[PDB]
Amino acid sequence: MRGSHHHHHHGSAVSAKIEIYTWSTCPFCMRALALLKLKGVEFQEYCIDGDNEAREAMAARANGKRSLPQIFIDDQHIGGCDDIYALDGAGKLDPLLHS
């Protein structure tokens, strides 16, 4: 195991689970994607263009909301584009991404 390794009872290596549901061409989705990309974090985008079934799966997790985008971090519903930008402006987004 050659390398410079961090030990703190981590056990199996896991990380933040970051999810965003989008339409690719929605300007609010595009703005939220830009913010996540600028943070440099690894994240999963559920691009659901034209997919009603996926929108209903999204709504089932997002308090019935079908507005876009919808963002989850470690399985918690964060909200939409305005919500993530508001958190960042308050200095509260970085801690949630783990930093």
Numbering used by the authors: 1 to 99
Quote from the publication.
In the case of the glutaredoxin that is the focus of this study, glutaredoxin A from the cyanobacterium Synechocystis sp. PCC 6803 serves as the preferred electron donor for the 2-electron reduction of arsenate to arsenite, catalyzed by arsenate reductase. As part of the thioredoxin superfamily, glutaredoxin A shares the characteristic thioredoxin fold. Our random mutagenesis approach has yielded four new crystal structures of glutaredoxin A, one for each of the following variants: R27L, A75I, A79S, and P84R.
The RMSD (root-mean-square deviation) between both structures is 0.099 Å over all atoms, and the Leu27 substitution was confirmed in the refined experimental electron density. Arg27 occurs at the C-terminal end of α-helix 1 of the wild-type protein and potentially forms a H-bond with Tyr74. In addition, Arg27 occurs in a cluster of other basic residues (...K-R-K...), so it is likely that it is part of a localized positively charged patch on the surface of the protein. Crystals of the wild-type protein diffract to 1.7 Å resolution, while the R27L mutation produced crystals that diffract X-rays to 1.2 Å resolution. The sizes of the crystals of the wild-type and R27L variants were similar, so the increase in diffraction cannot be explained by larger crystals. There is a possibility that more efficient hydrophobic packing between symmetry-related molecules, mediated by the leucine replacement, contributed to more efficient crystal packing. The R27L crystal structure lacks two neighbors; the A75I and A79S mutant have no net differences, while the P84R mutant adds three possible interactions.
